[PDB]
Design an enzyme around this catalytic site. Structure first.
Site, PDB file in Angstrom:
ATOM      1  CG  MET A  23     -73.240  -7.708 -32.671  1.00  0.00           C
ATOM      2  SD  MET A  23     -74.140  -7.043 -31.304  1.00  0.00           S
ATOM      3  CE  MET A  23     -74.532  -5.584 -31.634  1.00  0.00           C
ATOM      4  N   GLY A  24     -70.725 -11.816 -33.483  1.00  0.00           N
ATOM      5  CA  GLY A  24     -69.712 -12.898 -33.195  1.00  0.00           C
ATOM      6  C   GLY A  24     -70.158 -13.732 -31.949  1.00  0.00           C
ATOM      7  CB  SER A  25     -69.986 -15.188 -34.918  1.00  0.00           C
ATOM      8  OG  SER A  25     -71.024 -15.871 -35.577  1.00  0.00           O
ATOM      9  CB  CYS A  28     -68.331 -20.172 -27.524  1.00  0.00           C
ATOM     10  SG  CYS A  28     -69.483 -21.728 -27.631  1.00  0.00           S
ATOM     11  CD  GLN A  30     -74.410 -18.516 -35.879  1.00  0.00           C
ATOM     12  OE1 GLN A  30     -75.324 -19.149 -35.447  1.00  0.00           O
ATOM     13  NE2 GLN A  30     -74.153 -18.500 -37.291  1.00  0.00           N
ATOM     14  CB  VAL A  31     -73.266 -12.648 -29.593  1.00  0.00           C
ATOM     15  CG1 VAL A  31     -73.857 -11.362 -29.273  1.00  0.00           C
ATOM     16  CG2 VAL A  31     -73.213 -13.464 -28.363  1.00  0.00           C
ATOM     17  CE  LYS A  46     -71.834 -16.786 -26.735  1.00  0.00           C
ATOM     18  NZ  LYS A  46     -70.730 -16.574 -27.324  1.00  0.00           N
ATOM     19  CG  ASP A 129     -64.101 -18.664 -16.107  1.00  0.00           C
ATOM     20  OD1 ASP A 129     -63.029 -18.804 -16.805  1.00  0.00           O
ATOM     21  OD2 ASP A 129     -64.532 -19.509 -15.594  1.00  0.00           O
TER      22      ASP A 129
END
Ligand SMILES: COc1cc(O)c2c(c1)/C=C/C[C@H](O)[C@H](O)C(=O)/C=C/C[C@H](C)OC2=O
EC number: 2.7.12.2
Length: 270
Positions: A23-25, A28, A30-31, A46, A129
Protein backbone atom coordinates in the site's frame (compact mmCIF):
# COMPACT_ATOMS: atom_id res chain seq x y z
CA UNK A 1 5.58 -8.27 21.07
CA UNK A 2 4.06 -10.74 20.30
CA UNK A 3 0.81 -10.05 18.48
CA UNK A 4 -2.16 -9.00 20.67
CA UNK A 5 -5.68 -9.13 19.13
CA UNK A 6 -9.03 -8.45 20.83
CA UNK A 7 -8.07 -9.45 23.27
CA UNK A 8 -5.75 -12.44 23.28
CA UNK A 9 -1.97 -12.20 22.85
CA UNK A 10 -0.41 -14.60 20.38
CA UNK A 11 3.22 -15.10 19.42
CA UNK A 12 4.22 -15.19 15.81
CA UNK A 13 6.91 -13.68 13.58
CA UNK A 14 6.47 -11.54 10.42
CA UNK A 15 7.59 -14.42 8.31
CA UNK A 16 4.72 -16.36 9.87
CA UNK A 17 2.14 -13.81 8.59
CA UNK A 18 0.74 -14.35 5.12
CA UNK A 19 1.28 -11.38 2.83
CA UNK A 20 -1.39 -10.14 0.44
CA UNK A 21 0.09 -7.03 -1.22
CA UNK A 22 1.38 -3.50 -0.60
CA UNK A 23 0.00 0.00 0.00
CA UNK A 24 3.11 2.23 -0.01
CA UNK A 25 6.09 2.51 0.00
CA UNK A 26 4.67 5.99 -0.61
CA UNK A 27 6.81 7.35 2.27
CA UNK A 28 8.52 6.06 4.30
CA UNK A 29 8.81 2.25 4.33
CA UNK A 30 6.79 -0.43 2.55
CA UNK A 31 3.41 -0.61 4.32
CA UNK A 32 1.85 -4.06 3.88
CA UNK A 33 -1.53 -5.74 3.74
CA UNK A 34 -1.31 -9.13 5.42
CA UNK A 35 -3.29 -11.84 7.10
CA UNK A 36 -2.43 -13.33 10.46
CA UNK A 37 -2.69 -17.04 9.70
CA UNK A 38 -3.62 -17.84 13.38
CA UNK A 39 -6.95 -15.98 13.71
CA UNK A 40 -7.89 -14.86 10.21
CA UNK A 41 -7.30 -11.20 10.76
CA UNK A 42 -6.05 -8.87 8.03
CA UNK A 43 -3.83 -6.05 9.26
CA UNK A 44 -1.44 -3.29 8.30
CA UNK A 45 2.23 -3.82 8.72
CA UNK A 46 4.69 -1.02 8.14
CA UNK A 47 8.16 -2.38 7.36
CA UNK A 48 11.09 -0.11 8.34
CA UNK A 49 14.18 0.43 7.58
CA UNK A 50 16.72 -0.16 10.40
CA UNK A 51 18.76 1.06 12.18
CA UNK A 52 19.28 3.31 15.14
CA UNK A 53 21.96 1.79 17.40
CA UNK A 54 21.63 -0.42 19.29
CA UNK A 55 5.11 1.22 21.72
CA UNK A 56 1.25 0.91 21.88
CA UNK A 57 -0.32 -1.01 23.65
CA UNK A 58 -1.53 0.41 25.77
CA UNK A 59 -3.76 2.74 23.71
CA UNK A 60 -6.39 0.02 23.36
CA UNK A 61 -9.48 1.71 24.80
CA UNK A 62 -9.25 4.93 22.71
CA UNK A 63 -11.25 4.53 19.51
CA UNK A 64 -9.61 7.52 17.76
CA UNK A 65 -6.07 6.12 17.62
CA UNK A 66 -5.10 3.44 15.18
CA UNK A 67 -4.58 0.37 17.29
CA UNK A 68 -1.23 -1.23 17.30
CA UNK A 69 -1.02 -5.00 17.50
CA UNK A 70 2.73 -5.38 18.29
CA UNK A 71 6.25 -5.42 16.74
CA UNK A 72 8.53 -7.24 15.36
CA UNK A 73 12.29 -6.90 15.05
CA UNK A 74 14.76 -8.43 12.61
CA UNK A 75 18.33 -7.51 11.67
CA UNK A 76 17.13 -5.28 8.77
CA UNK A 77 13.63 -4.06 9.84
CA UNK A 78 11.47 -3.27 12.39
CA UNK A 79 7.99 -4.40 11.53
CA UNK A 80 4.92 -2.77 13.08
CA UNK A 81 1.40 -4.27 12.79
CA UNK A 82 -1.52 -1.91 12.85
CA UNK A 83 -5.26 -2.04 12.15
CA UNK A 84 -6.01 -1.81 8.47
CA UNK A 85 -7.49 1.58 7.49
CA UNK A 86 -8.49 3.50 4.32
CA UNK A 87 -5.91 6.35 3.77
CA UNK A 88 -4.06 9.44 5.11
CA UNK A 89 -5.62 12.82 5.18
CA UNK A 90 -2.63 14.24 3.21
CA UNK A 91 -3.28 11.75 0.43
CA UNK A 92 -6.99 12.70 0.27
CA UNK A 93 -6.20 16.38 -0.30
CA UNK A 94 -4.02 15.33 -3.27
CA UNK A 95 -6.43 12.63 -4.46
CA UNK A 96 -9.38 15.02 -4.22
CA UNK A 97 -7.42 17.92 -5.73
CA UNK A 98 -9.51 20.28 -3.58
CA UNK A 99 -10.50 20.95 0.10
CA UNK A 100 -12.35 18.65 2.49
CA UNK A 101 -15.90 19.85 3.52
CA UNK A 102 -16.11 21.62 6.89
CA UNK A 103 -18.46 18.89 8.12
CA UNK A 104 -15.67 16.26 7.69
CA UNK A 105 -12.94 18.31 9.40
CA UNK A 106 -15.36 18.86 12.23
CA UNK A 107 -15.65 15.16 12.75
CA UNK A 108 -11.88 15.02 12.30
CA UNK A 109 -11.23 17.71 14.83
CA UNK A 110 -13.27 15.65 17.31
CA UNK A 111 -11.57 12.34 16.64
CA UNK A 112 -8.22 14.16 16.78
CA UNK A 113 -8.61 16.38 19.82
CA UNK A 114 -9.91 13.53 21.95
CA UNK A 115 -6.96 11.39 20.87
CA UNK A 116 -4.33 13.91 21.89
CA UNK A 117 -6.35 14.52 25.00
CA UNK A 118 -6.42 10.78 25.62
CA UNK A 119 -2.68 10.33 25.19
CA UNK A 120 -1.82 13.21 27.49
CA UNK A 121 -4.26 12.41 30.38
CA UNK A 122 -3.77 8.62 30.29
CA UNK A 123 -0.14 8.08 29.29
CA UNK A 124 1.54 11.43 29.83
CA UNK A 125 2.19 11.51 26.10
CA UNK A 126 2.94 14.63 24.00
CA UNK A 127 2.74 13.12 20.48
CA UNK A 128 5.01 15.44 18.59
CA UNK A 129 3.61 15.29 15.01
CA UNK A 130 -0.01 16.33 14.34
CA UNK A 131 -0.47 16.46 10.54
CA UNK A 132 -2.58 15.18 7.60
CA UNK A 133 -0.26 12.24 7.02
CA UNK A 134 -1.04 11.05 10.57
CA UNK A 135 -4.81 11.25 10.28
CA UNK A 136 -6.31 8.10 8.92
CA UNK A 137 -9.77 7.88 7.46
CA UNK A 138 -11.60 4.69 6.53
CA UNK A 139 -14.27 3.25 4.24
CA UNK A 140 -16.75 2.87 6.99
CA UNK A 141 -16.42 6.40 8.37
CA UNK A 142 -13.89 6.13 11.31
CA UNK A 143 -11.17 8.79 11.75
CA UNK A 144 -8.05 8.06 13.67
CA UNK A 145 -4.68 9.36 14.75
CA UNK A 146 -1.55 7.49 13.77
CA UNK A 147 0.83 8.14 16.65
CA UNK A 148 4.18 8.04 14.80
CA UNK A 149 7.05 10.43 13.83
CA UNK A 150 8.43 22.90 3.32
CA UNK A 151 6.97 20.76 4.71
CA UNK A 152 6.76 18.95 8.07
CA UNK A 153 8.82 21.66 9.78
CA UNK A 154 6.13 24.24 8.94
CA UNK A 155 3.75 22.81 11.52
CA UNK A 156 6.08 24.03 14.23
CA UNK A 157 4.68 26.44 16.79
CA UNK A 158 6.21 29.84 17.54
CA UNK A 159 7.55 28.85 21.01
CA UNK A 160 9.53 26.03 19.38
CA UNK A 161 12.44 28.43 18.58
CA UNK A 162 12.11 30.69 21.67
CA UNK A 163 13.76 30.82 25.18
CA UNK A 164 14.22 27.22 26.57
CA UNK A 165 11.56 21.23 23.46
CA UNK A 166 8.91 21.40 24.79
CA UNK A 167 6.41 23.77 26.43
CA UNK A 168 4.04 22.11 26.07
CA UNK A 169 1.03 20.28 24.54
CA UNK A 170 0.00 23.62 23.05
CA UNK A 171 2.40 22.90 20.18
CA UNK A 172 0.22 20.04 18.93
CA UNK A 173 -2.74 22.43 19.19
CA UNK A 174 -0.91 24.63 16.68
CA UNK A 175 -0.34 21.71 14.27
CA UNK A 176 -4.03 20.89 14.52
CA UNK A 177 -4.81 24.40 13.33
CA UNK A 178 -2.45 24.37 10.36
CA UNK A 179 -3.72 20.92 9.47
CA UNK A 180 -7.23 22.32 9.52
CA UNK A 181 -6.41 25.35 7.40
CA UNK A 182 -4.27 23.24 5.02
CA UNK A 183 -7.18 20.90 4.99
CA UNK A 184 -10.15 23.24 4.76
CA UNK A 185 -8.62 25.37 1.99
CA UNK A 186 -6.91 22.42 0.25
CA UNK A 187 -3.80 24.54 0.00
CA UNK A 188 -0.89 24.78 2.40
CA UNK A 189 -0.93 28.21 4.23
CA UNK A 190 2.37 29.28 2.82
CA UNK A 191 2.28 28.97 -0.98
CA UNK A 192 5.32 31.25 -1.37
CA UNK A 193 8.15 28.73 -0.61
CA UNK A 194 9.83 26.02 -0.76
CA UNK A 195 12.01 24.20 0.73
CA UNK A 196 12.34 25.63 3.38
CA UNK A 197 13.26 27.83 6.42
CA UNK A 198 11.87 30.80 4.48
CA UNK A 199 8.98 28.94 6.14
CA UNK A 200 10.13 28.73 9.81
CA UNK A 201 10.76 32.42 9.62
CA UNK A 202 7.35 33.46 8.30
CA UNK A 203 5.84 31.53 11.27
CA UNK A 204 7.53 33.41 14.10
CA UNK A 205 7.65 36.45 11.85
CA UNK A 206 4.01 36.68 10.75
CA UNK A 207 0.49 36.42 12.21
CA UNK A 208 -1.51 33.17 12.08
CA UNK A 209 -2.83 32.07 8.67
CA UNK A 210 -6.36 32.10 10.13
CA UNK A 211 -9.33 30.90 8.15
CA UNK A 212 -10.58 33.06 5.22
CA UNK A 213 -13.96 34.69 6.01
CA UNK A 214 -14.75 33.75 2.40
CA UNK A 215 -15.30 30.06 1.71
CA UNK A 216 -18.47 29.77 3.80
CA UNK A 217 -16.96 28.57 7.04
CA UNK A 218 -19.22 28.41 10.06
CA UNK A 219 -17.60 31.09 12.24
CA UNK A 220 -17.71 28.43 14.92
CA UNK A 221 -15.05 26.78 12.83
CA UNK A 222 -13.17 30.01 12.04
CA UNK A 223 -13.25 30.58 15.80
CA UNK A 224 -11.77 27.20 16.78
CA UNK A 225 -9.21 27.18 13.96
CA UNK A 226 -8.16 30.53 15.36
CA UNK A 227 -8.05 29.67 19.07
CA UNK A 228 -5.50 27.10 17.97
CA UNK A 229 -3.40 29.39 15.74
CA UNK A 230 -2.87 31.68 18.74
CA UNK A 231 0.71 33.05 18.55
CA UNK A 232 0.77 33.57 22.32
CA UNK A 233 1.10 29.96 23.45
CA UNK A 234 0.70 31.11 27.06
CA UNK A 235 -3.03 31.82 26.93
CA UNK A 236 -3.49 29.30 24.08
CA UNK A 237 -6.15 26.56 24.61
CA UNK A 238 -5.31 23.34 26.43
CA UNK A 239 -7.05 20.32 24.97
CA UNK A 240 -9.93 20.49 27.42
CA UNK A 241 -10.80 24.07 26.49
CA UNK A 242 -10.99 22.92 22.91
CA UNK A 243 -13.18 20.02 24.05
CA UNK A 244 -15.67 22.57 25.28
CA UNK A 245 -15.47 24.93 22.35
CA UNK A 246 -18.62 25.07 20.29
CA UNK A 247 -17.29 23.83 17.00
CA UNK A 248 -16.41 20.62 18.88
CA UNK A 249 -19.79 20.48 20.67
CA UNK A 250 -21.62 20.78 17.45
CA UNK A 251 -19.58 18.01 15.98
CA UNK A 252 -19.79 15.67 18.97
CA UNK A 253 -23.56 15.60 18.26
CA UNK A 254 -24.10 16.47 14.55
CA UNK A 255 -24.58 13.40 12.42
CA UNK A 256 -22.36 13.25 9.24
CA UNK A 257 -22.19 10.66 6.36
CA UNK A 258 -18.43 10.24 6.64
CA UNK A 259 -18.45 6.71 5.25
CA UNK A 260 -20.69 7.76 2.40
CA UNK A 261 -18.37 10.73 1.66
CA UNK A 262 -15.09 8.89 1.77
CA UNK A 263 -16.53 6.22 -0.53
CA UNK A 264 -17.61 8.89 -2.97
CA UNK A 265 -14.21 10.59 -2.95
CA UNK A 266 -13.01 7.09 -3.88
CA UNK A 267 -14.83 7.79 -7.15
CA UNK A 268 -11.93 10.13 -8.04
CA UNK A 269 -9.28 9.22 -8.66
CA UNK A 270 -8.94 5.44 -7.76
C1 LIG B 1 -3.12 1.71 9.42
O1 LIG B 1 -3.41 1.48 8.04
C2 LIG B 1 -2.78 2.16 7.02
C3 LIG B 1 -3.34 2.09 5.75
C4 LIG B 1 -2.76 2.74 4.66
O2 LIG B 1 -3.33 2.66 3.43
C5 LIG B 1 -1.51 3.52 4.82
C6 LIG B 1 -0.95 3.54 6.22
C7 LIG B 1 -1.60 2.87 7.25
C8 LIG B 1 0.29 4.29 6.54
C9 LIG B 1 0.54 4.88 7.71
C10 LIG B 1 1.85 5.62 7.85
C11 LIG B 1 1.87 6.80 6.84
O3 LIG B 1 0.70 7.59 7.08
C12 LIG B 1 1.98 6.38 5.34
O4 LIG B 1 3.19 5.65 5.10
C13 LIG B 1 1.86 7.49 4.30
O5 LIG B 1 2.42 8.56 4.47
C14 LIG B 1 1.09 7.26 3.02
C15 LIG B 1 -0.40 7.64 3.13
C16 LIG B 1 -1.18 7.17 1.89
C17 LIG B 1 -1.08 5.67 1.59
C18 LIG B 1 -1.62 5.37 0.20
O6 LIG B 1 -1.77 4.90 2.60
C19 LIG B 1 -0.92 4.19 3.58
O7 LIG B 1 0.28 4.11 3.31
Amino acid sequence: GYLTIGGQRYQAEINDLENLGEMGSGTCGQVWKMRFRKTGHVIAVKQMRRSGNKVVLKSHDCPYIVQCFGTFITNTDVFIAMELMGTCAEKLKKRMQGPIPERILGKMTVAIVKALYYLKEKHGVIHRDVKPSNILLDERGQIKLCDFGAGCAAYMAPERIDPPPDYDIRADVWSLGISLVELATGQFPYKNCKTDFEVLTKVLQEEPPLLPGHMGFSGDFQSFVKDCLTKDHRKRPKYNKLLEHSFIKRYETLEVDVASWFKDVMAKTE
